[PDB]
A paper describes a structure:
We exploited soluble fHbp peptide V1.1 as a molecular scaffold to display the PorA VR2 loop, P1.16 (VR2 P1.16). VR2 P1.16 (YYTKDTNNNLTLVP) was inserted into six different β-turn regions in fHbp. We determined the atomic structures of ChAs with VR2 P1.16 inserted into position 151, 294, or 309, all of which generated PorA-dependent SBA titres. These structures were solved using molecular replacement to resolutions of 2.9 Å for fHbpV1.4:PorA151/P1.16, 3.7 Å for fHbpV1.1:PorA294/P1.16 and 2.6 Å for fHbpV1.4:PorA309/P1.16. All ChA scaffolds align with good agreement (route-mean-square deviations (RMSDs) range between 0.447 and 0.614) to fHbp V1.1, demonstrating that the fHbp scaffold is not perturbed by insertion of VR2 P1.16. In each structure VR2 P1.16 adopts a β-turn conformation that extends away from the fHbp scaffold. In ChAs, the VR2 N- and C-termini are effectively locked into a 'biological' β-turn peptide mimic by neighbouring fHbp β-strands, as confirmed by our atomic structures. Antisera raised against each ChA detected fHbp on the bacterial surface (p ≤ 0.0001), and certain antisera also demonstrated significant binding to PorA: antisera from mice immunised with alum and ChAs fHbpV1.1:PorA294/P1.16, fHbpV1.1:PorA117/P1.16, fHbpV1.1:PorA183/P1.16 or fHbpV1.1:PorA309/P1.16 (p ≤ 0.01 by two-way ANOVA), and from mice immunised with MPLA and ChAs fHbpV1.1:PorA151/P1.16, fHbpV1.1:PorA294/P1.16 or fHbpV1.1:PorA309/P1.16 (p ≤ 0.05 by two-way ANOVA). SBA titres were detected with antisera raised against fHbpV1.1:PorA294/P1.16 when alum was used as the adjuvant, and with antisera raised against fHbpV1.1:PorA151/P1.16 (a low level of SBA from a single mouse), or fHbpV1.1:PorA309/P1.16 when MPLA was the adjuvant. Although PorA was detected on the surface of N. meningitidis by antisera from mice immunised with alum and fHbpV1.1:PorA117/P1.16 or fHbpV1.1:PorA183/P1.16, or with MPLA and fHbpV1.1:PorA294/P1.16, these antigens/adjuvants did not elicit PorA-dependent SBA titres.
Author numbering: 79 to 182, 188 to 293, 293A, 293B, 293C, 293D, 293E, 293F, ...
The structure:
Amino acid sequence: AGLADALTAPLDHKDKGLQSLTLDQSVRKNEKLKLAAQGAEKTYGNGDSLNTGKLKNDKVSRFDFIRQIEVDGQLITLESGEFQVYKQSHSALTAFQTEQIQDSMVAKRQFRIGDIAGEHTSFDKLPEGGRATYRGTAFGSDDAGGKLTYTIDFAAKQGNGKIEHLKSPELNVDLAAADIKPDGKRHAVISGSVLYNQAEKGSYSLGIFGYYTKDTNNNLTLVKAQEVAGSAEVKTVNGIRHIGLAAKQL
């Protein structure tokens, strides 16, 4: 699988798919995150990069995470459980399957999406026309068999999707059509509603990822938006549930 190689071996530029994954939302500047798998364990801080080049693409790589916090002196364990990483060619996202937390150790189960990084497509460099259909995996708590189909129209700067084959019937939802907008860093992002049986059930956000090229005289020539990756919050009878979304072109 290459998990221990992803935790131990340094970054190699000849690896496939996404190579480096900057950990920012998964590890805050005051805390530390321990990852263990296949007999290896490494301690990552804030800003540290995860070597995803050794991981398999379009699959869920699972680790054992322990979230500690640095309070003046030694570290205090706040959380522990499973740490999921979904890798694509130009983007990757992380997920936290919380099993144990700190007493206020008490057993509590959660599922929260962590970092979502990659090669962001600038909103100012988007293609000005054409339809693009992205297909991929949508995965929730204890279920990675979700299928995502999200279409983007660049002429109208809109996009609508659909999630299928999830174990929870309330999570197979349709992603309402939403406009393409820039964020603070002017990345191409999409924020829309989540509908189930013609009922507004939640929200979803997808980031656009792809490569680009320049000519000999620093002029933009080629731009592609090949992947999308984000998350969704769906309301269920048992409470709010989060779902990780990733999709690419064929």
